[PDB]
Amino acid sequence: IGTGFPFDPHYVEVLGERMHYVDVGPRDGTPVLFLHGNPTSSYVWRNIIPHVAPTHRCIAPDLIGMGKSDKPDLGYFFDDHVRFMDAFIEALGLEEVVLVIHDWGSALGFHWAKRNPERVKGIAFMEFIRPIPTWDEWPEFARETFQAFRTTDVGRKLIIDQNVFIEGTLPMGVVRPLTEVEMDHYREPFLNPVDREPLWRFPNELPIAGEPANIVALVEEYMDWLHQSPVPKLLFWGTPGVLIPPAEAARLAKSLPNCKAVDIGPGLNLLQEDNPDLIGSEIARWLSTL
């Protein structure tokens, strides 16, 4: 599994702020938009893009306040990421797209797809945001931690001051051992604790036990849309998983229209780090069928 990031920087102005994105592959077709989540960047797609790039354009932006994008003084609520990602897509003049989404990127992708259904020709997704009705439906071993993350006192000491989402939560979301080189790439954007606001607000935005109300309703809405949509779907899952257990993955493969499920083997949250070659090859294969 490659540790390098051999991609030239591309930048575009979005609502007054510069956002960074990877941009490779030919301009003569339908682009593929890769959306990462918390606490990652376009780096998380480094070993998946080379499988798709030869046949399709690959665009992988860093969310505002993350990766190599600018760091404006914001609360970094989901609404902020929505405004910026909406404007990013328009700034690149993209008409029709295929989405490849993960974690909070999936919340952005599905929410955008719901509002622009005619512009989405396919969605590949993995370990995605869905409504968690109660704390019982959150992984048992991470309940205390994420309950602690969702506080203004303990949560901010952990995530902001001590950087545990990078130093702990990130590597614990990968089955195989993340190397020090890979950890350093993920560390780069958040060396200053003042820049870690996005890392704390994200887990506080998760739709768990009806809070926050707005995110729960927003996510419920795009899941209803996904169940009602005939758009091609590609669901990657692993065992034991984190947000999407093997049992739920199989249920979704049946209930969602036009959905193909692919088992990646052992995995937790960052499935891209456990089996990038299968994920990449299956996206390339799937794209040719569309």
Ligand X SMILES: *CCCCCCOCCOCCNC(=O)CN(C)S(=O)(=O)c1ccc(NC)c2nonc12
User: Could you list the residues that contact ligand X (CB under 6 A)?
Assistant: 37-38, 103, 142, 145, 162, 164, 167-169, 172-173, 242, 268-269
Query: Between residues 15 and 172, which has the closer beta carbon with respect to ligand X?
Result: 172
Q: Which residue, 142 or 253, is less far from ligand X as judged by CB?
A: 142
Stretch that binds Cl ion, among 18-26, 150-158, 199-207, 262-270 (CB under 5 A): 199-207
Q: What gap in Å lies between CA 71 and CA 192, rounded to an integer?
A: 11
**Is 145 one of the binding residues for Cl ion (CB under 5 A)?**
no
Answer yes or no whether residue 203 interacts with Cl ion by CB under 5 A.
yes
Among 14, 22, 38, 166, binds Cl ion (CB under 5 A): 38
By beta-carbon distance, which residue lies closest to ligand X?
A: 168
Least distance in angstroms from the C-beta of 149 to ligand X: 8
- Residues contacting Cl ion: total by CB under 5 A: 3
Per CB under 5 A, 186 contacts Cl ion: no
Enter the tokens of residue 268.
């937790």
Residue 124 beta carbon to ligand X: minimum distance, rounded to whole angstroms: 17
Q: How far is the CB of 131 from Cl ion (least distance, A)?
A: 15
Write out the residues near Cl ion by the rule CB under 5 A: 38, 202-203
